[PDB]
Symmetry: T
Subunit: 141 residues, 12 copies
């Protein structure tokens, strides 16, 4: 059972700066953490990160075609991209929107998400653990 975990722009640099806002973990540490939690639940997690909106669209496309669930932290494109929203709306399996930081306690523009209205559900502010709680929801649904 495959679960795609997809990270958007700038998330490749997790841990290098403001560990107050996004955690101390780097992206390789995140990938290993998610893979371990996913094996413990009976799932396989494919974890991918890209700064390129076209590349993220490609991965969502493949997820739609294989009818696989998506855990998406779209970074900045969360608030700006209709193209990514429409590609995510093709997913027949669940879609969990994840934000490491509490986007409601930050700038006003971070409060609006193209993704939330079409997601199965949203987890915000729970730090890197939010990804792990999303997998666990997909294990039980």
């Amino acid at each position: 059972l495959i679960v795609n975990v997809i990270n958007g722009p700038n998330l490749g640099r997790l841990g290098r700066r403001e560990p107050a806002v996004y955690g101390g973990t780097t992206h390789d540490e995140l990938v290993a953490l998610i893979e371990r939690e996913a094996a413990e639940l009976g799932l396989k997690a494919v974890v991918r990160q890209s700064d390129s909106e076209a590349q993220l669209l490609d991965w969502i496309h493949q997820a739609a075609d294989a009818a696989e669930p998506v855990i998406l932290n779209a970074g900045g494109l969360t608030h700006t991209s209709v193209a990514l929203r429409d590609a995510c709306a093709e997913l027949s399996a669940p879609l969990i929107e994840v934000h490491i930081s509490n986007v409601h306690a930050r700038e006003e523009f971070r409060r609006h998400s193209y993704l939330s209205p079409i997601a199965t559900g949203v987890i915000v502010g729970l730090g890197i653990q939010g990804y792990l709680l999303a997998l666990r929801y997909l294990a039980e649904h």
Copy 2:
């Protein structure tokens, strides 16, 4: 450690009505589910519900005095109540805001929350499992 799970107006009726929106589980079964998960996790779950703002405020106050964390589904008061937000901001232990339904796929006025800017984090649209995921985050701190 004690975790408080507080439910706001109307959630006493959980399970009888709009089962595609809220669960099929009743509040009684909900309380049981939470307690069992909390037990597994090394925690103790104190799960209470009320339709009165004054009573919710009283329980939040108690949690603040006790330095205990709160998992709050405020129901309609989420969107309307400054008095509740202000009492919640007194918590020193974590506050997770939970909604059973995906408040972002619903009427616009449900997209606005007084609680979210002052919560540690927010979990929405993951049905009743959002409560159990919130327990799991607090297990980790």
Copy 3:
């Protein structure tokens, strides 16, 4: 059958003074019960300044599949809790306002109930409640 008339905060002091007419709350319960007997209905007329109490009355009506005529006072404009309790009614809900809320302060022009109500009557004074009965008498 039974029709529930539910009045919200401040409405206990009807006709008292210190817009809404000179009829008191006692006199209105009597009016509604007279008119409803005449229509062949049983009217239960209840008032509470407590939101939680209003909800419990709504919940009861919804369990018994009975109609509600609701003047929710200030909470018309402010309570999502109450809207959601009323959205559970399977029998009709008629939202009533004694005053013409459209001829007053701008904030009184927004109701959380109207979108989920069967219909709404506004500005016709106390008779508003009687017209709602007459509507419910025809179903």
Copy 4:
């Protein structure tokens, strides 16, 4: 005592389309039903319908000049006509604004009315019976 019942554009076709929104009663049938209820109340009803704003303005002018009350379902002109509002503000007898459908459960632009601030009262969402109820109000003054 004459009461003037006035219907705006498109309502000549009542009963024929959107019966789920505007009822299955035709406009001839409405006129009869209203005339009957008026007589039972001790009133005489003059029911008229035009798709023409100039026409509806004329009939309002006559009602103002005879000091007769008006029951008005102005149809789409509810939302758009300042001219109709002003003609109506001249009236010294009462003005009751009626809508068949519940205009607050429908498109956002139907929630705004130039007539409501200047009317004695408003009835909405009670079907055709909404006209009978306004007649009952007027018999009582």
Copy 5:
């Protein structure tokens, strides 16, 4: 010469938290300072606090029936409660809206009050002394 001083939700806990916004004086201390100033001024002050909306309305109804002035710090109901405003609008004697904190220098939502337009006057930002100044006004009036 009776003055009612009425405190709304959360204010039973004054001085216990956020002492930089609301002060270090407790509610019981505040009762005593208000009582002492009211005596100096030739007034009898009745100081009451509640978390319950319905209870505040009853207190205001009694002030209405006895033509007594009210000094009101409605706390969070300031910005949300029309029922509270309506009850206050029946007062024939002066009404003083008081806030301890400078509500204009805090969150945007605290900058709107249902009470101010119908109050005699408003004092904000002058701490606990705001209530004492409102007493002095009423002794003058």
Copy 6:
């Protein structure tokens, strides 16, 4: 301590037209209450924004507190706000009328977010209530 009471535009004509207290009368009341509180009140009025700014600059330099009724400039003047922001002693914004029961435009104030506190609609006594707060620090 010296406390500066500053009145903005049009306030020189108080008492003419609707309280009945004139500006001379107002100065006199303020000075009395100030002395009863152990303070020396300096009360000035100007229709000129530049002059108002100068008075505020001087209170900042002398670390004195200001009671300010800015009149119509309350709702309009960023330059006045910034001058007041420089004050290290408390600033109290006072309005004679209840600005919240009037036109919408009067419900916005450039001064309130930077003031220590605001007193509105208590008439001329607001100036004396603001004196009393200042006397207590």
Copy 7:
């Protein structure tokens, strides 16, 4: 030459019911005044009034083809008619918008005009004499 004076809906009832929001002068009396004042200025005024938008459009069309000035009191259509603003935008000669009452001292919706951005100029609040002054502007070109 010829100057067109066009009044829109409700304005044929000037004088009766009414003001003075709009004066005590009647529409016949207004016609006489304008004609007289126009005579004195060496102009011929043609004064016409209609509650029909299509009829007012027709009169503007005639003025556009005759290359004649227009003094326009559009009534409620001032605030609502794009079609009237488009007819008037065709005029090559001057267009003077006139309102009897001071539209800026009334309801907010009257403060908005489709005609003002395309008019040569606007006169508001000077009563009926408003028309006579526009004539005198037209006499000077």
Copy 8:
């Protein structure tokens, strides 16, 4: 098949007193061009224009009863008429909204249409050829 092409206010004046914002083609030349295209397409076009909203409504009621498609350029009433929108919402055959000018390159208010949300589709800015393209859509369905 019969197709109705209905032009609303001021469009009788195509080509006379203004543009190209609108082309140099007169209404009669547009009628001839539309009839030639229709015939080439195997259809019969009926082209009607009015400055009167009531007349437009009558024509729309007829097309609805005749189950005939409509190409509508409602002119200024596009932006203003709820009554025209509702008459159009009843058409069972396609409705194509056409504007000669590019309404999106003009005033802000031209950018809102009551008709677009209930139209099959919309063509704007393509000049008079827009009508001939709408016809061609209808010949293919």
Copy 9:
């Protein structure tokens, strides 16, 4: 009877720039025109210009104490000054707001006036002749 004509900031420089729609007339030539016309009417005009807000307020205070009328072109302050509005709001005689240019055909910020709602009337876009029309109005009251 004395009439005050008061021009605000930058107006001293009339006819230096840019001749539509401020005109080619200088401030000196405008004083002379206003004076002749005032005499023709049986009135005395006192025409004054200043770039100082305080100076304007003083001139307004004089007219208020002398129960004299004012024709005011506040220039930029029309849009920005509550002080100037409050000063004019004291005038017991008529106040006419004048603008040389059609402020409705210009920047959106020029369509808001603090003066218009308290003025007797308003004249816009009729050039320097606006001031003479204003005098004419005052001659008749």
Copy 10:
């Protein structure tokens, strides 16, 4: 004459979902249809699709350099990209914006386009036929 038909993100997947919203025609079959209609018209169509914004900008830069027309369905970038609008605004030949779906009958965010104000004109809701009607306008200019 080369015409460029450019499709944006997700549109390579046409025909796979929401047929319904976008039709059953695949991208391959669309290219063939547009090629064949172009030939009928004496044009040569070059039909390209990409998920990459950078790639779209290069294709529009080439059309700007070669002075060739563009039919552009920008998909989600329609409502979000200034960069795309600016590159389009450089086009010297006609630019026709196409949407397969009726974007005004869908979410509010879809009713805003960066492209429309600088397009020659806009065709929406006519299905894939919209691309062929756009070719036909270009054949005439």
Copy 11:
């Protein structure tokens, strides 16, 4: 070649109250810096400050008549003054708007400028060096 540097209200107090904003340089010191840099560049700088709007207007009127450029830091009047804006629009030589602090990083009202749309360009946030950069642009014309 003369260059007017004009400083608006409160800027006389530079240096002695907000090093973080604003900076440590006094007005006298800024004068000497600017004159020095200007000499380096072959310009003569005239640097002037006033808290009086009438005074600033007069200096802008003078630079207008002498066709000299202006570096303007209007302080608070930037956000509030139409009069200042209009005087500035008369300059034929370049007008450089300067702000010492980054006004986009501050309260939302400092983000609106009446001067930006009419300036040649604008420099913000580069501290006092902003004045010296503007001179360098003017030295290049």
Copy 12:
């Protein structure tokens, strides 16, 4: 001492067409001017341009990891890109935002920038010299 100058989409085509907006200088020429003034100043300028947001993000990451300053003309992404803003907010060295044209003099959407609030300073409207002025600020830190 390295300074990176980074240009966004369409800016490769500088100088070619639109020279009254963006100058007649081409990109190659810009790079030569920038490198020459950086030498003059004791600095090394690395000047790059890309139409790809992913590439831009990578350039900004490398500047963050090297603690180098950035002068950024983001082009259209200025107004639209949160992902860009976030990458820029990692920069420990100064960030200068530069726009060639005066964005406040253009369309309203150009007056909003995601970069301004997190930049050190912003230069707009000063043409190509804007970049050289930003180089000079940075020389002086």
